[PDB]
């Protein structure tokens, strides 16, 4: 110990500046710290979880506070489609007078930023109506962040810290998460919708003062205990209904209409309340599967032991997988990040196609910002899922306790998995690029008719299968005779078919050959990013080049210039290489989404359908064309409110290019340069009276890869966020 970092003696005894960097970069790697035990490991993780929850509650609390203080929420409720919501107020003493003038918008007294997170529509749809309601929620979350820190501190003293056996109680944890954390929370949310949100959506302001007096339904509760639940679905709202008023209001609380509210263009609030209630009670029954202290339930160990196919095509099946995952926190985090990244992308794909918050589909800047945000979030989460999968193989995988099960068999034929992932990436890359270049050459020579435009007929057939008419393939939901259509005409199909064939929303947009080419670029990005992460995770314990890689850990610089050269041979470097492909993949995904919508919102879908089939169209008719108002955020003749993006736009270009220095130039050059600088300081008068207490050295090789990747990613995200919002909000459509 003796000095920073107190958890690593070898870092503390470093005489150079490297002591500080590695002390920061390894603060949360509890397993590498000195004198760590399984108890201290789970306990520090437990308290870190509480601290995170406190962070999240405090963050949401602050968001409510500024919307209620400097925001537009009360004025925005009156005009949902004519009021620009306010994020907070701007107080920058570097502002010139015109900067104050151009940034004063949304109907405020001083300069303000226009919020683009969608919390206004979210809070209006759930029942919040006045700034006082937002102040109440902020105090509650500030108080919740307080008790989160309280519980985190509480379980760090003896007799409150639990044993590692308590953390390894998987059966009880799953039952409670499915029953309580998943189901009871969804059940209570359905309760909030049917008490406050739905009546709030009909003109009735239900709050804590009067929620005990009002009835959510005229004949409340009674039918629920009888079985005549259909009385809760009798009188929905008319298709000619105004959200904050009562003209067209009904009295139903649980419906299955299937479409959108025609005015708000968001999902039916009764449908959402019924949805949460149905999935909740489904989670409640499902949360009674595993065995606890009552003599009934399953042993997850025994279920895994019993799933072994005779004939031995999977060897010993899943035997030993229970303890393999229950003892490895990296395995559990890998599964958690994998599932979370999938449902994060699921949220992205559904919030733009099935908007659930009132008056959010018309806020085009908000829809673009939200989809881009979650897709990059999900991309990072997926890279982390595979990163911790490799970390599990190195730090926790016991080959003898996983003998001849499915997990060890993955390693047994690692070459087959990696080679075929390589073939699929090569196939997709060769052909997708080739077709794009072919069409580029055709349009260069002025012969558009010679392009190769393949019709995405399989996804078109699926859209017709959902009842879309634009392609006329006459399958179920699109054909009058299929039983899939007859069984649903009574319920969701009227509203569903009404919404899918509306040419304004984005519920299953019309797709053409341009969409076929972009989706194959997406397949290339997914396959190659998967290839990088899987090859690194399977070759993490060893390779023909370095058969003892597991002894060197997860993150090390290299193995030297011997044996031909072993640069970027660790699994950490595999992650580091895959993040570039993740950013490239999400870049393709979001370039696709933003261009299709920004042409749809402009009513010019033909420009996308005709220009997305060749890459010169992407450079010219998407990036170059939409950058106009952005780059003119400030010109030699003045500026407007888009200047903050024109600046951030260039800011992102700088950080990104700065990362190239850390990624192209490597260490030894900078070490010799620092040596020539240390001599300069020791031989300079006056200044040599100042002595450094940490020896200046060049950044570590792994540190350089990390710093270069962080600059690359920060520039990536900030450059695109600036262009996205400025090109969309500059038009607002």
């Amino acid at each position: 110990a003796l000095r920073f970092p107190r958890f690593s003696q070898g870092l503390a005894q470093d005489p150079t500046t490297r002591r500080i960097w590695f002390g920061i970069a390894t603060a949360h790697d509890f397993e590498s710290h000195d004198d760590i035990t399984e108890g201290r490991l789970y306990q520090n993780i437990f308290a870190s979880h509480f601290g995170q929850l406190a962070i999240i509650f405090l963050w949401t609390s602050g968001n409510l506070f500024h919307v209620a203080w400097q925001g537009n929420f009360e004025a925005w409720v009156q005009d949902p489609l004519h009021v620009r919501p306010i994020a907070h107020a701007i107080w920058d003493p570097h502002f010139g007078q015109p900067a104050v003038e151009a940034f004063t918008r949304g109907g405020a007294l001083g300069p303000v930023n226009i919020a683009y997170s969608g919390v206004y529509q979210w809070w209006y749809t759930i029942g919040l109506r006045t700034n006082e309601d937002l102040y109440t929620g902020a105090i509650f979350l500030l108080f919740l962040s307080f008790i989160s820190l309280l519980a985190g501190w509480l379980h760090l003293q003896p007799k409150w810290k639990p044993s590692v056996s308590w953390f390894k109680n998987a059966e009880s944890r799953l039952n409670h998460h499915l029953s309580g954390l998943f189901g009871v929370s969804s059940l209570a949310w359905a309760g909030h919708l049917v008490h406050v949100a739905i009546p709030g959506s009909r003109g009735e302001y239900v709050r804590w003062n009067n929620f005990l007096s009002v009835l959510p339904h005229p004949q409340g509760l009674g039918p629920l205990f009888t079985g005549q639940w259909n009385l809760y679905a009798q009188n929905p709202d008319s298709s000619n209904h105004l959200f904050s008023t009562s003209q067209g209001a009904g009295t139903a609380i649980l419906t299955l209409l299937g479409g959108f509210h025609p005015q708000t263009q968001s999902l039916w609030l009764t449908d959402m309340a019924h949805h949460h209630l149905a999935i909740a009670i489904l989670f409640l029954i499902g949360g009674h599967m595993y065995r606890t202290n009552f003599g009934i339930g399953h042993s997850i160990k025994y279920i895994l032991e019993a799933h072994i196919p005779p004939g031995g095509r999977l060897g010993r099946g899943h035997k030993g997988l229970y303890d393999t995952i229950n003892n490895s926190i990296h395995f559990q985090l890998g599964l958690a990040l994998a599932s979370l990244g999938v449902i994060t992308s699921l949220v992205a794909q559904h919030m733009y196609s099935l908007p659930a918050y009132a008056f959010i589909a018309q806020d085009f800047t908000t829809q673009a910002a939200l989809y881009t945000h979650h897709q990059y979030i999900a991309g990072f989460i997926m890279t982390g899922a595979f990163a911790h999968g490799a970390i599990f193989f190195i730090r926790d995988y016991n080959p003898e306790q996983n003998a001849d099960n499915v997990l060890a068999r993955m390693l047994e034929h690692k070459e087959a998995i990696i080679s075929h992932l390589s073939w699929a990436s090569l196939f997709l890359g060769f052909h997708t690029l080739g077709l794009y270049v072919h069409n580029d050459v055709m349009l260069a020579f002025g012969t558009p008719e010679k392009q190769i435009l393949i019709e995405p007929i399989f996804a078109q057939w699926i859209q017709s299968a959902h009842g879309k008419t634009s392609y006329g393939f006459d399958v179920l939901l699109s054909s009058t005779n299929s039983p899939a259509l007859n069984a649903g005409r009574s319920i969701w199909l009227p509203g569903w078919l009404n919404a899918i064939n509306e040419n304004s929303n984005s519920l299953f947009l019309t797709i053409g050959p341009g969409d076929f080419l972009v989706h194959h670029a997406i397949a290339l990005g997914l396959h190659t990013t998967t290839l990088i992460l899987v090859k690194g995770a399977l070759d993490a314990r060893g390779s023909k080049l370095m058969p003892d890689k597991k002894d060197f850990g997860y993150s090390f610089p290299c193995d030297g210039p011997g044996r031909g050269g072993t640069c970027d041979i660790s699994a950490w470097d595999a992650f580091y290489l895959a993040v570039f492909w993740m950013l490239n993949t999400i870049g393709w995904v979001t370039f696709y989404w933003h261009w299709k919508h920004i042409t749809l919102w402009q009513g010019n879908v033909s420009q996308f359908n005709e220009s997305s089939t060749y890459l010169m169209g992407w450079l010219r008719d998407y990036l170059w064309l939409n950058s106009s108002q952005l780059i003119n955020g400030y010109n030699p003749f003045g500026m407007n409110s888009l200047s903050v993006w024109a600046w951030m736009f260039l800011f992102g270009h700088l950080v990104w290019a700065t990362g190239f220095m850390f990624l192209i130039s490597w260490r030894g050059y900078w070490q010799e340069l620092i040596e020539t600088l240390a001599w300069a300081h020791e031989r300079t008068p006056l200044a040599n009276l100042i002595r450094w207490r940490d020896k200046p050295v060049a950044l570590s090789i792994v540190q350089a890869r990390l710093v270069g990747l962080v600059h690359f990613s920060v520039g990536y995200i900030f450059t695109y966020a600036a262009f996205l919002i400025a090109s969309t909000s500059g038009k607002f459509g």
Binding site: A1, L2, R3, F4, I20, G23
Partner: peptide, 30 residues
């Protein structure tokens, strides 16, 4: 009026105290 007090308190005074205190702790010896 409150921004005229808290914006410098978090962009000037807070990083000043934070960077100076972290410098003393990082450079401290036992």
């Amino acid at each position: 009026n409150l921004p005229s007090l808290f914006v410098p308190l978090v962009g000037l005074l807070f990083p000043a105290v934070a960077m100076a205190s972290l410098f003393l702790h990082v450079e401290k010896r036992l």
